[PDB]
Amino acid sequence: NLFGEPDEGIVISRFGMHADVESADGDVHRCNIRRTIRSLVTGDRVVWRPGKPAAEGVNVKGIVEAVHERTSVLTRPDFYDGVKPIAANIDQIVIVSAILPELSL
RNA sequence: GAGGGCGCUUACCACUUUGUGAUUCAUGACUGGGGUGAAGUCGUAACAAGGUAACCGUAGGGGAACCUGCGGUUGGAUCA
Ligand SMILES: [Mg+2]
Ligand SMILES: [Mg+2]
Ligand SMILES: [Mg+2]
Q: Which nucleotides of B are covered by protein (CB under 7 A)?
A: 37-44
Exposed e or buried b for every residue in A10-42, given b needs 16+ CB within 10 A?
Answer: bbeebeeebbebebeeeeebbbbbeeeeeebbb
Q: List CB contacts of A21: < 8 A, sequence separation 6 or more.
A: A9, A10, A11, A12, A29, A30, A31, A46, A48, A50, A62, A64
DSSP lists the bridge partners of residue A87 as: A42
- The single-letter code of the amino acid at A55 is A
- The single-letter code of the amino acid at A76 is R
What is the rounded distance in angstroms from the CA atom of residue A74 to the CA atom of residue A51? 30
DSSP lists the bridge partners of residue A85 as: A75
Q: A82 CA distance to ligand 1 centroid (A)? A: 18
Contacts of range A36-40, beta carbons closer than 8 Å, 24 or more positions apart: A37/A64, A37/A67, A39/A67, A39/A84, A39/A85, A40/A11, A40/A14, A40/A64, A40/A67
**End-to-end CA gap in chain A:** 52
Q: Among all strands, which nt has the closest C1' to A79 (CA)? A: B44
Experimental method: cryo-EM
Q: Among all strands, which nt has the closest C1' to A76 (CA)? A: B41
Find the Å distance, CA of residue A23 to C1' of nucleotide B35. 34
Find the Å distance, CA of residue A95 to C1' of nucleotide B16. 82
What is the rounded distance in angstroms from the CA atom of residue A42 to the CA atom of residue A67? 12
- This structure's resolution (angstroms)? 5.2
Contact (CB, 8 A) for A64 and A33: yes
Contact (CB, 8 A) for A47 and A28: no
What is the rounded distance in angstroms from the CA atom of residue A3 to the CA atom of residue A62? 7
Find the Å distance, CA of residue A80 to C1' of nucleotide B72. 36
Spatial CA neighbour of A14 closest among A46, A47, A42: A42
